[PDB]
C-alpha cells in the first residue's frame, strides 16, 4: 500500500531503483484491506481482521 | 632498445615530462562515449573500428 524499494537492477548498464507493492486494484478503498493475510508462525494464514 | 629482446613482457622506458602534472605530448586524447545500451562489447567493436 506504500511501495518499497528493494534493491536495483541494470537497465541496459544504468543502475536502478526496484520496488514491490500492490497491484493497483488491490489498494483502493479501505474494503480491500482484506485480501491482506499474512504467515504467523504456526504457517497459519492469518489475517488482518484478526 | 636493450629492453626489447625481453620475452612477452613490454618494458619501456622514459623521461618524465617538463611539468610532471600537465599537458605532455602535443598529443591528442580521445575517449569514445557509449550514448545507449550499446554494450561493453558494442563500444569495444566500435573502439577497434575506429
Not at chain 1, 478503498?29 to 497459519?44: E, F, K, M, S
Not at chain 2, 613482457?9 to 618524465?16: G, I, K, S, Y
Amino acid at each position: 500500500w506504500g511501495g518499497s524499494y528493494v534493491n536495483d537492477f541494470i537497465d541496459r548498464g544504468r543502475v536502478k531503483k526496484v520496488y514491490v507493492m500492490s497491484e493497483a486494484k488491490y489498494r483502493m478503498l479501505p474494503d480491500d484491506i482484506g485480501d491482506w493475510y499474512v504467515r504467523a508462525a504456526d504457517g497459519q494464514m492469518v489475517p488482518f481482521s484478526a | 632498445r636493450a629492453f626489447s629482446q625481453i620475452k612477452d613482457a613490454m618494458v619501456f622506458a622514459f623521461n618524465l615530462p617538463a611539468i610532471v602534472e600537465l599537458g605532455t605530448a602535443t598529443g591528442f586524447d580521445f575517449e569514445l562515449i557509449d550514448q545507449a545500451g550499446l554494450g561493453h562489447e558494442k563500444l569495444t567493436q566500435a573502439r577497434n573500428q575506429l
